[PDB]
Design a protein that fits this description.
The structure is a homodimer of 83-residue chains. The first copy, chain A, has 83 residues and is mainly alpha-helical. Chain A has one domain. Helix content of chain A is 52%, strand content 0%. The longest helix of chain A is centred in the first third of the chain and has 15 residues. Chains A and B meet through α1 of A and α1 of B. Chains A, B: Carrier of the growing fatty acid chain in fatty acid biosynthesis. Chains A, B: One of its GO terms (molecular function) is acyl binding. Chains A, B: Belongs to the acyl carrier protein (ACP) family.
Amino acid sequence: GSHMNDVLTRVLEVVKNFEKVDASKVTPESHFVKDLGLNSLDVVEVVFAIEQEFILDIPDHDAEKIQSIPDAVEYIAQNPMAK
Amino acid sequence: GSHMNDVLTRVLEVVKNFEKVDASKVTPESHFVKDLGLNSLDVVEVVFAIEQEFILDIPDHDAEKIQSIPDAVEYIAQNPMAK
């Protein structure tokens, strides 16, 4: 395996688990709005659940930039404080 | 999940893949010699395969403590250079 895959695997299960998200539509490249059909309030929920997974309180300016699984994976995998 | 579980998952599959190792005997608590029936030279091979998994040079002095799956998970999950 790999650390990036470790992160991607947990992000995938977090996003799939969201009640509004069709888990069968989720890919490592899925964009929350354009692919998964979420609205702005939904994205806040998913990102917070991602923050829960890695115990990582993300500053608002960085957290608003996370709109897709690649965005989330790229930010978490480079953050040495992800748990 | 967790970083420790991410490590444990990769260590488990590395050890199971060892031809000398009966995968059905492998648990998160398995001791390489006493539980999996390996000898001292086998343990050297297993540690190297762990070094491969996390792209991590473990010094010989640190390798002396890695005799079991709990030992390996603890050492790797606390080494911030594990990949």
